[PDB]
Amino acid sequence: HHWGYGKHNGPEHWHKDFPIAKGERQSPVDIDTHTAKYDPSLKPLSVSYDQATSLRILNNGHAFNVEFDDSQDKAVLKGGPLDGTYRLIQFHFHWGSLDGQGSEHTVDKKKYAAELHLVHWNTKYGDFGKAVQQPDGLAVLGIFLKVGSAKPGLQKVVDVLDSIKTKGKSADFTNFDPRGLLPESLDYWTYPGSLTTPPLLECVTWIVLKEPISVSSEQVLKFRKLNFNGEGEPEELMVDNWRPAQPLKNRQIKASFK
């Protein structure tokens, strides 16, 4: 497969190799704040990252992933809309070529400069590859980025990107604390959806925080110096690696807050 984000292989093309691209529960979606209903049934959200063990950062040709040790329940997401325990496996971002675009989810059609996805899998399925075959197999926590003041807890990430400029490069990335990437509030919207890149599997409970984090222009400029291409190949800057909003269809977005 040769999917990407260019004119010739971008989101409009994905359906030809991944027909679930036109399915009933695809992501991302526009969050219409005046249609999402407060749900008093939602239990509170529990982000338990104290014991998180980051290992490595990888440029995979689509984004970069910060990978975690998910061999035990070290860093988990529970509560909110979720049953059971969801283990953190990696985080990554989607971002734009300019500050006016980059996020996958939108909020009343507003696009943010970027979007962070913390990916977790349901431990009742034993491994990630089994989890993605289940309608409740993954929980992705999504967090918007806006450009303003610098985010200190991001700087370790931006400072390693020079070392993984091209597709297939990785670097050691131990002792990184993903708590530094959260906003103050855990207020959120939630809906059932999918992975936003191929294979586009319909296995995700989306939890999208209301409060964006602020990052500096200098920080996001450094994201945009990454490459989609491999070493020695003609430079294609890693920008605009986001899928646009998909049809909501027969789904309801719930709010944890009034």
Ligand SMILES: Cc1ccnc(S(N)(=O)=O)n1
């Ligand atoms: C791990 C993975 C694969 C595909 N898509 C995603 S995403 N962008 O829905 O978080 N994560």
Ligand code: NA
């Ligand atoms: Na892993």
Ligand SMILES: [Zn+2]
């Ligand atoms: Zn993502």
